[PDB]
Structures are given as C-alpha cells and as structure tokens.
C-alpha cells in the first residue's frame, strides 16, 4: 500500500502562535478579494469561498498545501516506480539513495546510482543526509545540460 499522506501529528493541539498566523492569512485574503472583485458583483462570491476557511486552522492550511504538492507530483512522476528501482538497489548493494533538486523551477526526485556517488565525512552514520560532503559524477546529455543550466 502506498498511502503516504502528510498528517498533523497532533490534530487537536492548536496554539496561539498558530492562531495569529491564521489571522494574518485570513486578512491577506481579505485584501486581495477587495482589489480583485469589481464593486460587489463578485465580492459575495469570494466571501462565500472565504467563510468556510474560518473553520480551518493554520495546521490545516499547511497540511493541505503539503498534500497537494505531494499528491500531484507522485502522480506526475510516477514516484512509486522510482522507489521500486531503488529497492532493487537495496537488495543488491545495500544502498538506496534519492536526490531531490530543483530543475526548471520544479521539485524533482531522482534515484542515485550507488556506483556514481561518493560520500565523505559521514561518520559511522547509516543515513546519507548525515554526510558533510557528497560528490556526484555522471555523463549527461548535452540537452540535459542545456535543460538544467541554460540560465
């Protein structure tokens, strides 16, 4: 089963620092619907859209944004197949490595060839995030270099 949902760990624990951050967001949506709506024609359409967000919390607004980012990109990239190839690396060399970068303004996730990654100053640490220095060497397409570094 692949149900990897961002959850609030304590969904019944709202604080005043979360309540102040919710109030800033709600007033910011007040100003932009004040500008974007032309003189009460569509102000009460935006107002009915905004009133049901008073039921929400700051941790609810954040847990929706996190899921919508993860729901779309799991389906866009077919990320379960990316994880299936790395599990095959796990049963072969004992190493499952994934790189998350920004390419073209998009978040993108790649699996790393364990023969083409050098991990330095990691310690005896099991995790690859705990390294102080990593070198990645691969042979890229000329189109991939111009798709990645054109700017």
């Amino acid at each position: 089963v692949f149900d990897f949902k961002v959850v609030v760990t304590n969904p019944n624990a709202i604080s005043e620092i979360e309540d102040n951050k919710k109030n800033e967001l709600l007033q910011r949506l007040q100003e932009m619907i004040t500008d974007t709506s032309i003189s009460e024609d569509e102000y009460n359409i935006k107002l009915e859209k905004l009133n049901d967000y008073y039921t929400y919390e700051w941790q609810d607004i954040r847990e929706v944004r996190a899921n919508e980012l993860l729901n779309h990109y799991i389906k866009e990239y077919d990320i379960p197949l990316i994880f299936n190839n790395g599990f095959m690396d796990a049963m072969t060399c004992g190493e499952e490595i994934y790189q998350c970068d920004i390419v073209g303004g998009e978040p993108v996730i790649e699996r790393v060839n364990p023969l083409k990654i050098r991990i330095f100053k990691s310690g005896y640490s099991n995790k690859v995030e705990d390294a102080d220095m990593i070198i990645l060497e691969d042979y890229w397409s000329p189109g991939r270099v111009i798709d990645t570094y054109y700017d």
Partner: peptide, 13 residues
C-alpha cells in the same frame, strides 16, 4: 524552543 508551540496545545504549554 518554538517547535513545542506547534506540537502542543495552549494548556500543554
């Protein structure tokens, strides 16, 4: 630590 202001309540704080 302001992280505990997100994982706890107000009564828990």
């Amino acid at each position: 630590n302001k992280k505990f202001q997100y994982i706890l309540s107000d009564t828990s704080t």
